[PDB]
């Protein structure tokens, strides 16, 4: 009984961490709340680096490929969603993009 | 940590730890019970097997047996699965042939 109780307490402390706290995998509230407008994004993550690098490329001519500043399009909202979040699969979407027409 | 948790779970399954320092008692001196595996050609009720293998000298409802558990080998289980798969295929093919030749006849 002593060894069994130790084993069961270990299993209990394992399952508690595995199941708690229970957060939902994904809900539409995530995408509803982490939506910020262009003005809000610009107000949130802006530095003089963009204007300075614009002047620098205008004066030099070097080709820049990646943006010089990391843009967080959520304005600090992406850190609110749990890390294991992923969009669920939606079967039979009511859209026309999956047909891939090129003539209309 | 993966290697370590594997080793530790193996040790725990072996059951070698004991708070009073010292080797644990042996398993053979403890397991005061026996198991009997009987092969049957068809399914039989557990209460039937119990009343047929019960000890006639034990005045207890368990009749000298603890538990009777029925199982099927993995070979025959896979055989039954393949058999039902083939049976579904055969039903589909027979219905297809019937509905295809009902108009040809």
């Amino acid at each position: 009984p002593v060894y069994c109780e130790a084993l069961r307490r270990e299993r209990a402390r394992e399952e508690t961490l595995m199941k708690w706290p229970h957060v939902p995998e994904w809900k539409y509230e995530y995408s509803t709340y982490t939506r910020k407008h262009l003005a809000d994004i610009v107000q949130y993550n802006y530095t003089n680096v963009v204007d300075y690098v614009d002047r620098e490329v205008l004066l030099t001519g070097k080709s820049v490929w990646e943006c010089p500043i990391h843009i967080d399009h959520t304005c600090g909202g992406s850190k609110t969603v749990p890390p294991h979040a992923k969009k669920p699969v939606r079967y039979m979407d009511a859209g026309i993009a999956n047909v891939g027409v090129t003539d209309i | 940590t993966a290697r370590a948790v594997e080793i530790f779970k193996e040790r725990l399954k072996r059951g070698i730890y004991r708070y009073p320092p010292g080797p644990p008692p042996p398993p053979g001196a403890h397991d005061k019970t026996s198991v009997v595996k009987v092969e049957l050609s068809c399914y039989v009720e557990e209460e039937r097997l119990r009343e047929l293998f019960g000890r006639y000298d034990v005045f207890e409802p368990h009749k000298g047996i603890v538990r009777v558990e029925l199982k099927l080998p993995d070979e025959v289980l896979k055989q039954k699965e393949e058999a039902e798969q083939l049976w579904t295929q055969y039903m589909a093919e027979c219905s297809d042939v019937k509905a295809y030749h009902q108009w040809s006849t």
């Binding site: 009984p1 002593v2 109780e5 | 708070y19 009073p20």
Partner: protein, 70 residues
Amino acid sequence: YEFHEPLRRKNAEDMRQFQTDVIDMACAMLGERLLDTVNASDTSSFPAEWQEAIAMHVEEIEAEMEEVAA
């Protein structure tokens, strides 16, 4: 183990007390049977020391009954 050791120590003590009570009730039944067989059957009596002890303890128990009744 610290939680489970007294739980089995108490059971062991209870088993020992059960055996002691078994011995005591067996002695009581022995007394009752020897008594209701000696006074029933004939040519079967206790030794002299046993008879003297039984008589003195009978007198003591009668005195105790008188004390508890008074």
